[PDB]
């Protein structure tokens, strides 16, 4: 096969989740990275993009990623649909929307709008102030617009609300990734989170449409409830569910020819369980990720969710398809408990199943230093969890140890050759990205770590993508991170 990757990963996903495909997963072919002329591998909408420089002055990531979103917003003809994490986008983000929106209306098209938002859960005003701001802001513009706007809890107790972060627009061009539209993390600041999304065209981004009118579906049920929706629309206009579906075709025009596997998942409070899915998980044992023995175990111990949230198969697939190396960045491979469990152990098992067959790992988190951006004390807790699932399989701690050694790297992320920013704050990282045999990669939202939210991404199987990725991102990412390692198996170090 041409995509032995996307191959195993489409078989586990139709394992899993059977009757979510083509709502919250769909492989799709005759995509295209949508990179510039210019610059090819710019498809890869970084940020702030300014490798070796601790005062942050040239940020051409920053740059092309507000210009980007602009540029798409602007070629819309029909439909722009975004989600992402609560705040509201701000600052130059939404500038760059509202710039986007303009350009668009000027153009003579009348567009259908969602801006959708997960919030932790009387009287929330936020949907309203940003519909009326933002209708404000878009001047003569507002009058070629109907306009949705919604915030949304999808379980209280669980802490499941929305956390992806897509820009789709006319089903035809998609933006997703780990960056929230947050000016003062992002932005104004001379300590910016380092962060990606990545732009591509094709059926894919209809897979996205499709993925926001599952979720648009329950807000927009559920928008009576207080606690679970705030919503707010322009003049009259109603709340709607299916925009994608019954605005733009069922599958996009073909701009390439990458294969792609979109995929998500719904969290917690959406649905329980696809009741197509006939998947019977071996679901292993530890005794040291659910720190207190009352939490309910989503992650670990949980079959029914994993049937409704394809995205941990999926990732967890991926790295089993690895057969020679795989780079993972990420803000956290471990989550605080309670009231998540520590860690996925399927994921630490696939791992350490990959190490013990000489397959090379790499994991650079965000610095410690940080602790939003960190939920650990010290690289430590995650070589420590990985030396004791490599003990299962290798037959005790020495043997565990060594195949770590021999196998991994591991370390806190760094920018340029200074230990923190020039202005004295820690780097700050968030991506979720895997990349694995510089051939098939996930950029999206959901992270690694336990997290029981509605999350997004895509995994692409294009080996000349992955070597842009790698020279744009993967290599000044280890250039620079590589002297916080405390494993390191090119330069035989072992300090763990
Ligand atoms: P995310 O914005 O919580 O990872």
Same mark, same amino acid.
Request: proline share 5%.
């Given at each position: 096969?041409?995509?032995?990757?996307? *191959?195993?990963? %489409?078989?586990?996903?139709?394992?899993?989740?059977?009757?979510? /495909?083509? *709502?919250?997963?769909?492989?799709?072919? @005759?995509?295209?990275?949508?990179?510039?002329?210019?610059?090819?591998?710019? =498809?890869?909408?970084?940020?702030?993009?300014?490798?070796?420089?601790?005062?942050?002055?040239?940020?051409? &990531?920053?740059?092309?990623?507000?210009?980007?979103?602009?540029?798409?917003?602007?070629?819309?003809?029909?439909?722009?649909?975004?989600?992402?994490?609560?705040?509201?986008?701000?600052?130059?983000?939404?500038?760059?929307?509202?710039? &986007?929106?303009? /350009?668009?209306?000027?153009?003579?098209?009348?567009? !259908?709008?969602?801006?959708?938002?997960? #919030?932790?859960?009387?009287?929330?005003?936020?949907?309203?102030?940003?519909?009326? %701001? +933002?209708?404000?802001?878009? &001047?003569?513009?507002?009058?070629?617009?109907?306009?949705?706007?919604?915030?949304?809890?999808?379980?209280?107790?669980?802490?499941?609300?929305?956390?992806?972060?897509?820009?789709?627009?006319?089903?035809?061009?998609?933006?997703?990734?780990?960056?929230?539209?947050?000016?003062?993390?992002?932005?104004?600041?001379?300590?910016?989170?380092?962060?990606?999304?990545?732009?591509?065209? @094709?059926?894919?981004?209809?897979?996205?449409?499709?993925?926001?009118?599952?979720? =648009?579906?329950?807000?927009?049920?559920?928008?009576?409830?207080?606690?679970?929706?705030?919503?707010?629309?322009?003049?009259?206009?109603?709340?709607?569910?299916?925009?994608?579906?019954?605005?733009?075709? !069922?599958?996009?025009?073909?701009?390439?020819?990458?294969?792609?596997?979109?995929?998500?998942?719904?969290?917690? &409070?959406?649905?329980?369980?696809?009741?197509?899915?006939?998947?019977?998980?071996?679901?292993?044992?530890?005794?040291?990720?659910?720190?207190?023995?009352?939490?309910?175990?989503?992650?670990?111990?949980?079959?029914?969710? *994993?049937?409704?949230?394809? $995205?941990?198969?999926?990732?967890?697939?991926?790295?089993?398809?690895?057969?020679?190396?795989?780079?993972?960045?990420?803000?956290? +491979?471990?989550?605080?408990?309670?009231?998540?469990?520590?860690?996925?152990?399927?994921?630490?098992? #696939?791992?350490?199943?990959?190490?013990?067959?000489?397959? !090379?790992?790499?994991?650079?988190?965000?610095?410690? #230093?940080?602790?939003?951006?960190?939920?650990?004390?010290?690289?430590? %807790?995650?070589?420590?969890?990985?030396?004791?699932? +490599?003990?299962?399989?290798?037959? @005790?701690?020495?043997?565990?140890?060594?195949?770590?050694?021999?196998?991994?790297?591991?370390?806190?992320?760094?920018?340029?050759?200074?230990?923190?920013? #020039?202005?004295?704050?820690?780097?700050?990282?968030?991506?979720?990205?895997?990349?694995? *045999?510089?051939?098939?990669?996930?950029?999206?939202?959901?992270? +690694?770590?336990?997290?029981?939210?509605?999350?997004?991404?895509?995994?692409? $199987?294009?080996? /000349?993508?992955?070597?842009?990725?790698?020279?744009?991102?993967?290599?000044?990412?280890?250039?620079?991170?590589?002297?916080?390692?405390?494993?390191?198996?090119?330069? @035989?170090?072992?300090?763990?």
């Amino acid at each position: 096969s041409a995509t032995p990757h996307l *191959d195993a990963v %489409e078989q586990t996903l139709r394992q899993v989740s059977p009757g979510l /495909e083509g *709502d919250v997963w769909e492989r799709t072919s @005759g995509n295209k990275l949508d990179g510039s002329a210019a610059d090819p591998s710019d =498809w890869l909408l970084q940020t702030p993009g300014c490798w070796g420089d601790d005062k942050c002055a040239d940020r051409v &990531g920053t740059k092309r990623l507000l210009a980007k979103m602009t540029e798409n917003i602007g070629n819309a003809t029909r439909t722009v649909d975004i989600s992402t994490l609560a705040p509201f986008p701000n600052g130059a983000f939404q500038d760059a929307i509202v710039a &986007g929106l303009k /350009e668009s209306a000027a153009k003579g098209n009348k567009l !259908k709008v969602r801006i959708l938002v997960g #919030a932790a859960p009387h009287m929330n005003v936020i949907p309203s102030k940003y519909r009326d %701001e +933002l209708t404000a802001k878009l &001047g003569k513009a507002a009058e070629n617009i109907t306009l949705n706007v919604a915030s949304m809890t999808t379980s209280k107790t669980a802490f499941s609300w929305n956390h992806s972060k897509i820009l789709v627009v006319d089903g035809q061009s998609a933006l997703t990734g780990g960056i929230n539209s947050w000016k003062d993390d992002y932005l104004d600041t001379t300590h910016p989170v380092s962060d990606v999304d990545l732009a591509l065209t @094709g059926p894919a981004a209809g897979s996205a449409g499709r993925y926001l009118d599952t979720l =648009w579906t329950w807000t927009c049920q559920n928008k009576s409830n207080i606690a679970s929706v705030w919503f707010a629309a322009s003049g009259n206009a109603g709340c709607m569910p299916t925009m994608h579906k019954d605005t733009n075709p !069922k599958a996009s025009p073909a701009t390439g020819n990458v294969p792609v596997i979109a995929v998500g998942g719904l969290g917690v &409070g959406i649905k329980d369980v696809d009741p197509k899915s006939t998947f019977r998980p071996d679901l292993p044992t530890a005794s040291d990720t659910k720190c207190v023995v009352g939490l309910h175990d989503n992650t670990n111990a949980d079959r029914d969710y *994993d049937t409704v949230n394809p $995205e941990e198969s999926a990732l967890r697939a991926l790295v089993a398809s690895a057969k020679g190396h795989i780079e993972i960045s990420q803000q956290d +491979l471990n989550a605080t408990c309670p009231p998540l469990p520590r860690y996925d152990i399927r994921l630490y098992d #696939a791992l350490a199943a990959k190490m013990a067959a000489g397959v !090379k790992v790499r994991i650079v988190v965000s610095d410690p #230093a940080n602790r939003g951006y960190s939920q650990i004390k010290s690289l430590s %807790e995650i070589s420590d969890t990985l030396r004791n699932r +490599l003990a299962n399989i290798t037959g @005790g701690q020495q043997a565990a140890k060594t195949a770590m050694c021999s196998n991994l790297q591991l370390a806190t992320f760094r920018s340029s050759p200074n230990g923190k920013w #020039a202005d004295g704050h820690p780097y700050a990282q968030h991506h979720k990205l895997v990349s694995v *045999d510089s051939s098939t990669f996930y950029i999206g939202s959901k992270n +690694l770590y336990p997290s029981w939210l509605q999350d997004f991404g895509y995994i692409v $199987e294009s080996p /000349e993508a992955a070597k842009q990725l790698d020279a744009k991102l993967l290599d000044p990412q280890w250039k620079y991170s590589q002297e916080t390692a405390t494993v390191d198996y090119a330069r @035989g170090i072992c300090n763990a």
